[PDB]
């Protein structure tokens, strides 16, 4: 069960890296469908892995004991890191490919931040990143301008 929990950050990074390569193939330097396919693979992976991690933690009796806190700390790291990582992508896609869906996809990660899964929006506040993250969403829209 330990292996499952630790793997979640790492799987998302593995997809992230594949995406960093794909980033250099944006701006119609590879055909557009292949870049969106890769992109869909990567977006969904990261999100899924957050979800999976939450479920595992809560129902393994680690939210029913006071050992919880070490795990919460682990969650704190994962959540803003992955969410950020995913969010700074799609901004790049929106300018380079010139497709408003990616203005939408960037904006859409804001809803995940505000959902309670160990109160993700407090972690972002605490870290001082909530405004930083907020301003980036606004600027995505300015890309069509």
């Amino acid at each position: 069960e330990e292996i499952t929990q630790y793997e979640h950050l790492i799987k998302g990074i593995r997809e992230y890296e594949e995406w960093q390569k794909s980033v250099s193939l944006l701006s119609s330097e590879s055909n557009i469908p292949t870049l969106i396919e890769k992109l869909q693979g990567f977006s969904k992976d990261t999100f899924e892995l957050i979800k999976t991690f939450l479920v595992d933690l809560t129902s393994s009796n680690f939210a029913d004991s006071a050992d919880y806190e070490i795990l919460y700390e682990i969650r704190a790291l994962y959540t803003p890191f992955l969410l950020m990582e995913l969010h700074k992508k799609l901004v790049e896609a929106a300018k380079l490919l010139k497709i408003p869906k990616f203005i939408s996809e960037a904006l859409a990660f804001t809803s995940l931040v505000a959902n309670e899964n160990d109160k993700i929006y407090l972690l972002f506040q605490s870290s001082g990143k909530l405004k930083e993250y907020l301003d980036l969403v606004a600027r995505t829209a300015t890309l069509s301008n």
Binding site: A114, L134, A138
Partner: protein
């Protein structure tokens, strides 16, 4: 102009010296750029403009009320956006109000259903309550499958009172009621007391007297001060 033309970077940073006028702009009821406008305002750390905007959102039947699924979604989004109030603009009080609001609609509906099924009770005055001769009339028109009559729902809601809601008037006058004037508060409190002491004297079994008295001690009503007991 800028808010319309999706030129949000130019608005804050390129003209840093008309800022003071830009606070005037925030105080608008809505800036004008539709329902995408308010979103931009949550995003900039310029929340104050948006709270005022969202009011105009919730009366439009085309921004909420397209369909059931979309409607429920919109309500969720407004709530979540409220959670992202920082300290930029102290809309924390509004944040609380947005959360409160689904509980408010339930309180409204709750009491409404009761009145529809003859929830309102007959008036104590005599055999039948005159209010009912009015209450029945309001129920029927709204029981007919026809157009929604706004006036009819407002009148109907308050006129006949749940006995499940008598406790809140007593609680409120203890905590808040010295602000209304002692003489007002005393009068209302005395009204309820009259009825309470008008039953224990009728028979021989009291126990009525203490329940209202001892009752205010549970929520520390005397401690709130100036609250008398049944007497």
């Amino acid at each position: 102009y800028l808010i319309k033309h999706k030129k949000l970077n130019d608005l804050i940073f390129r003209f840093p010296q008309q800022h003071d006028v830009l606070i005037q702009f925030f105080q608008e009821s809505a800036p004008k750029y539709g329902h995408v406008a308010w979103i931009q305002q949550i995003l900039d750390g310029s929340y104050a403009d948006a709270m005022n905007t969202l009011k105009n959102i919730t009366v439009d039947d085309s921004k909420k009320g397209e369909s059931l699924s979309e409607c429920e979604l919109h309500l969720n989004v407004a709530k979540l956006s409220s959670l992202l109030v920082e300290k930029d603009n102290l809309d924390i009080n509004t944040l609380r109000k947005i959360q409160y609001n689904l509980d408010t609609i339930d309180a409204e509906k709750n009491i409404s259903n009761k009145l529809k099924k003859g929830e309102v009770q007959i008036c104590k005055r005599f055999k039948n309550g005159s209010i009912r001769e009015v209450f029945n009339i309001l129920v029927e028109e709204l029981k007919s499958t026809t157009v929604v009559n706004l006036s009819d729902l407002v009148e109907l809601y308050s006129m006949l009172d749940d006995e499940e809601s008598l406790f809140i008037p007593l609680r409120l006058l203890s905590v808040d009621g010295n602000l209304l004037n002692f003489e007002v508060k005393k009068f209302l409190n005395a009204l309820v007391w009259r009825r309470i002491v008008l039953l224990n004297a009728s028979n021989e079994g009291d126990k009525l007297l203490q329940h209202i008295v001892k009752r205010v001690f549970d929520e520390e009503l005397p401690k709130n001060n100036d609250f008398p007991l049944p007497s």
